[PDB]
């Protein structure tokens, strides 16, 4: 059938797309909303936010792929964002990579075996001072050591 | 409860700004209430928005995102077109080494509030918008749970005050496109579509968000408009060098002892920004070289330079990455290659071609499999990014790198063998 909302995410949309004047300025919280719930935009997901949205699908789309910070390739509870612009790469993004590499076994665009962590090349996260910055989904840190690092990531279940 | 955020070192020599900021946690309405807060916005409502627009213009604020424009000037150009208008206040960060905006929403977010409402008042908007990035989820929930708070204290909804003036301030958010700094594509962005620029003109203070006179102004630009109306333009005008006066954030970064932000006059000279306030090298190792951002390069013999707006002066958004001796100028110039390369937003020709083919030919040069002809494309292709280009970005890909190469040739000599 129609895949459809679950409740407790349609709720979520319905109040993000009503928090605008008009709906269609809605459309970025919405697809940031369904990668924090679904852990990637399923594909399947934009036929109905675009009715949701009164925009056409191929705009919704069209918008998806623009946008660097949504991936509708794959999914992972977990986003570590490393940040390899000018500042964090000389102070140590490599240090940190190879930490994860150590910890985790991924490279940076790779998901973990239980699909828990994929590690995600960005640009500056604007840390710079606190280089090299990471983020794990919302929560951003500086990088100290691997064994600093290790501690983090266990708090991400 | 917000989510983690790194506790960016903050220091001032004026405690406007930074005076709470300089603190690294939130500060709510009650504390913000106690320093006097919304008492400049209280004021504002009992002068006319025309009287607001003088004070703000004599004050000389100049935008703090990048363009230096006149701030009062711009509001005077929104005003001449018909109403309806809005606000944007540009919570976009993207270039790199730049984190002086996430400070003030972070920490003192109803400054930032206070100055979008007094500055909204005095263009005659009562719509209003936060255009923050997607990697600042902290600075997003800080915003939207301290404008609730605004909202309770009678500061913001309809008939501010009894002053009889409207506004909403709406809470967008940014997906990891630079180019949605850029002040028309942002508004691209708010309509709800790709963060594509728009042909200028028409400017967005003539025609912008829904085709009506737009103002989008930087975090830190409408931060210094509630000293203007609190302190008198006058006496804010006496604040650093009268021709570029005001409180200054500048983004340290790189190898200083005392990375962060640090509240300074613009009469400071970069060589005092470094040594003086950000304690110098790590190591005491001699200066290379300083990046103003994704912008410039500015060498060792180059720190005794203000960091105002002035033409033989530093400029930019006043960001300063330091490297040492002991860097690498090419693989640092690589990886501003290989920003433009991310963010061009490929609307335009020389622009997506130049920014992605500098960065591919540079990673070439940098990794030693260069050919010859990848060397004299790589000079060309750096020289013909400008052209066609509708915005700043195409303009500026290939400025610092240039610079490099004409500052540092031997370094870049290494490299040809
Ligand atoms: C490609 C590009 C990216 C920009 N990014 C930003 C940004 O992240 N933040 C910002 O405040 N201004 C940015 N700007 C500058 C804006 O065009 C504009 O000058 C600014 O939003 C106006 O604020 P101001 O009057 O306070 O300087 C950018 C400009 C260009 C051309
Ligand atoms: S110059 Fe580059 S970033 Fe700017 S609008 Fe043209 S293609 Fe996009
Ligand atoms: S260079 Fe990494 S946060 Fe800016
Ligand atoms: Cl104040
Ligand atoms: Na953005």
């Given at each position: 059938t129609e895949f459809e909302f679950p409740e407790?995410?349609?709720?979520?949309?319905?109040?993000?797309?009503?928090?605008?004047?008009?709906?269609?300025?809605?459309?970025?919280?919405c697809l940031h909303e369904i990668q924090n719930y679904?852990?990637?935009?399923?594909?399947?997901?934009?036929?109905?936010?675009?009715?949701?949205?009164?925009?056409?699908?191929?705009?919704?789309?069209?918008?998806?792929?623009?946008?660097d910070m949504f991936d509708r390739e794959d999914k992972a509870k977990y986003r570590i964002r490393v940040c390899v612009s000018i500042v964090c790469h000389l102070m140590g993004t490599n240090k940190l990579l190879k930490a994860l590499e150590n910890i985790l076994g991924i490279k940076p665009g790779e998901v973990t075996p239980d699909g828990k962590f994929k590690i995600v090349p960005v640009q500056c996260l604007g840390a710079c001072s606190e280089a090299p910055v990471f983020m794990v989904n919302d929560d951003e840190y500086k990088f100290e050591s691997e064994v600093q690092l290790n501690e983090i990531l266990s708090r991400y279940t | 409860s917000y989510p983690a955020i790194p506790r960016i070192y903050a220091e001032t020599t004026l405690n406007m700004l930074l005076k709470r900021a300089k603190k690294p946690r939130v500060h709510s309405?009650?504390?913000?209430?106690?320093?006097?807060?919304?008492?400049?916005?209280?004021?504002?409502?009992?002068?006319?928005?025309?009287?607001?627009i003088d004070w703000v213009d004599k004050s000389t604020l100049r935008g703090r995102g990048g363009a230096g424009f006149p701030t009062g000037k711009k509001w005077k150009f929104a005003v001449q077109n018909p109403g309806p208008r809005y606000f944007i206040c540009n919570a976009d960060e993207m270039e790199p080494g730049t984190f002086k905006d996430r400070i003030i929403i972070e920490r003192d977010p109803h400054l930032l509030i206070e100055g979008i409402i007094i500055s909204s008042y005095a263009i005659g908007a009562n719509e209003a918008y936060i255009y923050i990035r997607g990697e600042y989820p902290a600075g997003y929930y800080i915003l939207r749970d301290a404008i609730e708070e605004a909202k309770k204290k009678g500061f913001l909804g309809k008939n501010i005050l009894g002053s009889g003036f409207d506004l909403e301030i709406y809470v967008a958010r940014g997906a990891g496109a630079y180019i949605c700094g850029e002040e028309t594509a942002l508004i691209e962005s708010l309509e709800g579509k790709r963060g594509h620029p728009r042909l200028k003109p028409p400017y967005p203070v003539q025609k912008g968000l829904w085709g009506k006179?737009?103002?989008?102004?930087?975090?830190?630009?409408?931060?210094?408009?509630?000293?203007?109306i609190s302190m008198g333009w006058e006496e804010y005008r006496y604040i650093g060098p009268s021709d570029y006066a005001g409180p200054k954030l500048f983004p340290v970064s790189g190898k200083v002892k005392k990375p962060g932000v640090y509240e300074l006059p613009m009469n400071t000279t970069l060589r005092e920004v470094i040594f003086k306030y950000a304690g110098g090298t790590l190591g005491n190792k001699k200066v290379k070289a300083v990046f103003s951002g994704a912008l410039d390069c500015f060498s060792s013999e180059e720190l005794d330079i203000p960091m105002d707006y002035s033409p033989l002066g530093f400029g930019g958004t006043?960001?300063?990455?330091?490297?040492?001796?002991?860097?690498?100028?090419?693989?640092?110039?690589?990886?501003?290659?290989?920003?433009?390369?991310?963010?061009?937003?490929?609307?335009?020709?020389?622009?997506?071609?130049?920014?992605?083919?500098?960065?591919?030919?540079?990673?070439?040069?940098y990794k030693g499999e260069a050919t010859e002809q990848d060397w004299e494309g790589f000079d060309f292709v750096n020289r013909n990014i400008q052209p066609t280009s509708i915005c700043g970005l195409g303009a500026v890909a290939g400025r610092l790198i240039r610079q490099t190469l004409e500052k540092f040739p031997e370094e870049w000599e290494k490299y040809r063998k």
């Open positions: 407790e995410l349609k709720t979520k949309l319905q109040e993000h797309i009503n928090y605008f004047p008009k709906k269609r300025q809605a459309i970025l919280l679904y852990g990637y935009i399923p594909p399947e997901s934009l036929k109905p936010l675009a009715d949701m949205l009164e925009l056409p699908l191929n705009h919704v789309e069209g918008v998806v792929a623009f946008y | 309405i009650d504390e913000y209430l106690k320093d006097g807060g919304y008492q400049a916005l209280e004021k504002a409502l009992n002068m006319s928005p025309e009287e607001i006179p737009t103002v989008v102004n930087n975090v830190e630009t409408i931060a210094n408009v509630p000293f203007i006043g960001t300063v990455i330091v490297l040492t001796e002991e860097d690498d100028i090419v693989e640092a110039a690589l990886k501003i290659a290989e920003f433009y390369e991310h963010e061009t937003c490929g609307q335009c020709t020389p622009c997506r071609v130049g920014c992605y083919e500098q960065a591919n030919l540079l990673e070439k040069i």
